[PDB]
Swiss-Prot record, chain B:
<protein>
    <recommendedName>
        <fullName>Multidrug resistance protein MexA</fullName>
    </recommendedName>
</protein>
<comment type="subunit">
    <text>Component of the MexAB-OprM multidrug efflux complex, composed of six MexA subunits forming a hexameric tube, binding to a MexB trimer, which interact with the trimeric OprM outer membrane channel protein. OprM is thought to not directly contact MexB; instead, MexA joins MexB and OprM by forming a funnel-like hexamer anchored to the inner membrane. MexA may initially form a hexameric ring complex with MexB prior to OprM, then OprM undergoes a conformational change as it contacts MexA, allowing the periplasmic gate to open.</text>
</comment>
<comment type="similarity">
    <text>Belongs to the membrane fusion protein (MFP) (TC 8.A.1) family.</text>
</comment>
<comment type="function">
    <text>The periplasmic linker component of the MexAB-OprM efflux system that confers multidrug resistance. Functions as the major efflux pump for n-hexane and p-xylene efflux. Has been shown in one study to be involved in the active efflux of the autoinducer N-(3-oxododecanoyl) homoserine lactone, thereby playing an indirect role in quorum-sensing; but has been shown in another study not to be involved in efflux of this autoinducer. Over-expression of the pump increases antibiotic and solvent efflux capacities. Implicated in the secretion of the siderophore pyoverdine.</text>
</comment>
């Protein structure tokens, strides 16, 4: 009903998309905390153990 | 005088094949306390 301007709707939508990018940054950083194997095959032995 | 020869017979039996390999002993969980801050 245009009770709020399109300018301060585009600003709020830009803030929403920018904050969603800044939270998917932390989501892929939590994806980097756990270690995902990049390719498949015979894994060898652990060079560092639990706690190192 | 015929040639007299010591003669043994062969019999089939099981046999195991062990080996011996050298190597060190690494621990199960060997941590190492590196610090994560700056100070004395």
């Amino acid at each position: 009903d245009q009770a709020v301007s399109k300018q301060q709707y585009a600003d709020a939508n830009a803030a929403y998309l920018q904050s969603k990018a800044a939270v998917e940054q932390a989501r892929i950083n939590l994806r980097y905390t756990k270690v995902l194997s990049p390719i498949s095959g015979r894994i060898g032995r652990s060079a560092v153990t639990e706690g190192a | 005088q015929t040639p007299e020869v010591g003669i043994v017979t062969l019999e089939a039996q099981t046999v195991t094949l062990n080996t011996e390999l050298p190597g060190r002993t690494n621990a199960f969980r060997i941590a190492e306390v590196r610090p994560q801050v700056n100070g004395i």
